[PDB]
Design a protein around this ligand. Sequence first.
Ligand SMILES: Nc1ccn([C@H]2C[C@H](O)[C@@H](COP(=O)(O)OP(=O)(O)OP(=O)(O)O)O2)c(=O)n1
Ligand SMILES: [Mg+2]
Lengths: 406, 553
Amino acid sequence: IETVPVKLKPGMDGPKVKQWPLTEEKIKALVEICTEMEKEGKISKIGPENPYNTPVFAIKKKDSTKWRKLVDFRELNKRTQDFWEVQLGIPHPAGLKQKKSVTVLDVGDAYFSVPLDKDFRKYTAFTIPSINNETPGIRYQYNVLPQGWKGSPAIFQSSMTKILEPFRKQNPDIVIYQYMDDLYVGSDLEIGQHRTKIEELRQHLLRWGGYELHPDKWTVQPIVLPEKDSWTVNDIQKLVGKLNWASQIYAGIKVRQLSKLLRGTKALTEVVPLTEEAELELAENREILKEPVHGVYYDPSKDLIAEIQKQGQGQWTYQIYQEPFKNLKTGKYARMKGAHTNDVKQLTEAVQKIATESIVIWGKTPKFKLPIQKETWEAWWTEYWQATWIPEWEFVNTPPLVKLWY
Amino acid sequence: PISPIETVPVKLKPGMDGPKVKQWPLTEEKIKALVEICTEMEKEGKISKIGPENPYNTPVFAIKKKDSTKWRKLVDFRELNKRTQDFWEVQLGIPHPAGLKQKKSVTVLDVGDAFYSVPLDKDFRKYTAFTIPSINNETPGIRYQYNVLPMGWKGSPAIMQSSMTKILEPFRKQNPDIVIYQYVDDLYVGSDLEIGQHRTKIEELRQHLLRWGFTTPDKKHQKEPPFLWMGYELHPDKWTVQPIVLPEKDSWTVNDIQKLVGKLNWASQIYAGIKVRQLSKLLRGTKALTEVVPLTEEAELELAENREILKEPVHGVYYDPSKDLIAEIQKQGQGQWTYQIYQEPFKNLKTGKYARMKGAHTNDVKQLTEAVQKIATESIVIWGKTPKFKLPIQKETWEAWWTEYWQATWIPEWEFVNTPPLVKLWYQLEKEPIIGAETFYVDGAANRETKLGKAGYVTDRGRQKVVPLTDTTNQKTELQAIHLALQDSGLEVNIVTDSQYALGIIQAQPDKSESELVSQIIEQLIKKEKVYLAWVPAHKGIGGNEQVDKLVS
DNA sequence: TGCCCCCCCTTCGGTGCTTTGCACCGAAGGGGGGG
Ligand SMILES: Nc1ccn([C@H]2C[C@H](O)[C@@H](COP(=O)(O)OP(=O)(O)OP(=O)(O)O)O2)c(=O)n1
Ligand SMILES: [Mg+2]
């Protein structure tokens, strides 16, 4: 086979990111995985004259004990040429989010049968660490299409189309979407019959070389206003501030007639009766918050952003947007683990499910704004990661002024 | 001898040429010591004479090595390093004796002149050129180039370490129950073999190293305990640090105090309770390493406390995989924490301290969380797992924190330990407004151009006040308005601000701050009995807020 | 008059916010220690 010429973006150098510490069980797994890969010639031992590096770690699913090497190519992918500039990119089918159930298959192994541009391999170096720094780090670079590199689905796109089309030929009602190392395969068949054509799909690929999602249960939870039969000054101030915020998102929401219900310097716990002109204002605003906001459309040329808020008792709210206050989706994630003692685990799982939904719906993951300290996240998150991809993220600290999304 | 190992190819950075710097003129007496050094290297083929075609140069010098009769050669490759290609360093960290297991038989070997036994890429050697001036620059002088890794070149440490790893790799796989710690050129070799077969394996390792050109002189071959290793002393059942000697001085300069703090930090890995906050405070706001700083009273006390700790002897122990790791943290005051890591009681593997101020405003629970995170990371590095924790915070306290704090926050499985002072939240904010409590509507504004502002309030009980402020900011006036409302109210208060900046700081329950003003607010919240704190949007005619806003204007 | 690595404490300067200072964070200075 002939390699495809690959370039970084103009004026950019390759990744130079330090390896972070790994536990014993993860180091063992990398060493087993990488030495078998070196024997098969998929990676090559290198030295320090290669100035590039990318962090590596390992993730084990609850369902399958078998470890899975995971390289953080997030930096490399940002500096790699677009394959929409060369038009070798693969589109997303808008018929996936409609499906009854969607299974996710890890097809990363198909990439290991295609060589990578000799001049590009050096950008893929990684380093395995040493318990108690007993030895210096051990370095490899890839010789084939790496798992996690954004260029592998693009280079191997054509090969993927021809392997699948018999299956697509024979099941026109099923939709398959590649996203990096993953296949998202959705159908409308019964819960147990759906699974068997999943296993039929497997062995067609196995011949050459997680769990069921359910999209039509991805309920949108909107902005709600409390209802009591008594209203304190504090209740009306908290409601006026909450709608004054929502007027940046919705249209035609007014506070003039609940505002001067609070005319004067009143005590916070004094019970104020509602004007008729105030129930007029409130019952109306309640249903602008009912159904979604007119005029918000997805734009594939812009990035997706996700904000999450911790709400307590295991619940987490989130919003996905591209322009501020023009949400394409608002939701609430709940924890069914039952441990009820981990906040980082919950957030880590929340980012995977939110990201999964954006893949199914729009075909790419959003950049997350995470409600956690950088160093708390980095102490623990890899303990709970189960996806073969990793989204972009940043860390924010904004207290609630409103509890807008409760 | 020079290793027959393949060289590692190296490049200059793109667009750059080689160094070209005149060697600083030196005396004829040192010049032929120079001459002496290169003549003998030339007989081992470590360097070769060159001439005027090679247009590059770089200057040379030497420093006394602690040997009785040995010297270290060095060449000032500062300029070549700048033009040499970037390297990915393979030394990722420093091995620690608390990470070693008990071994029946132990050896420590060192390779002799490791760098000079590793060859340098042929196409690169011409950039290592150096001149020894002859006849006080009357003649061109002798010129050499390196054929091996020069000391002082940016790439020499990595290429040497990398070369040693490939040479050791066959021997490691051949016999997997021999521990070899490899640090640059220093080899610790442990095993559970009787000292007979051990020494067979040792001689066999030495012969393997020598076929690749790495000598192991008897002088650096340690065969009996206590072993000198990485700055420590290894005993069969325990380990100690080599003696720490702190400066004793009548008058202290900034640079003296800098050395003292570093020594104490180094000691803190095994001596429990070391503190440096008051000594380091003397370095703030200084302007010269030679500036004389008088010790404060608190610094003398802290120094004296550390000196008492250091005159006791102490030891770490080695690691037993068959047992849990336990980490216990104590609180020491002013944002300082100290910890011990052990497996059986009163037998520390190591100790440590955590004392960083992250953020302008924080509290003890956050900082405890940060210490836990530092210890967690250190443990993964040394032992490859995290420990079980013993912490002086009650389950009620922690649970009150991760519910009323809006950021995700978790600490690993731990056990409460009653060792005062305990870590506690110093006040909590009421979730709902307090019946019968006064209601304060606070506001502050400042003019950015004039840096003049006001802070005031109005009240449901009819109270009002306005204070002029000079040389302040927008955010300070808002903090100031909350400051006064807490000052003039009772034990129970309801407060309404329009500054989510102020709400953001205070809702986080800080107990310490780099700001005197925020510190003042903390002291007042701690005195109170109940506080409810409410936000409203500004400039929307909301009863209370608009009254106080008008008053401030 | 040199090189590489880890650690801590201080200081400085860039980023972004529906800002006009502020808080955050990474890099570079100093020190310890290893080779
Ligand atoms: N001040 C120092 C000390 C060490 N090293 C590097 C070069 C050395 O080759 C190597 C190891 O130093 P050693 O103290 O072990 O002594 P040498 O290897 O130089 O000579 P020998 O071991 O034969 O006495 O680390 C350095 O560059 N500068
Ligand atoms: Mg040596």
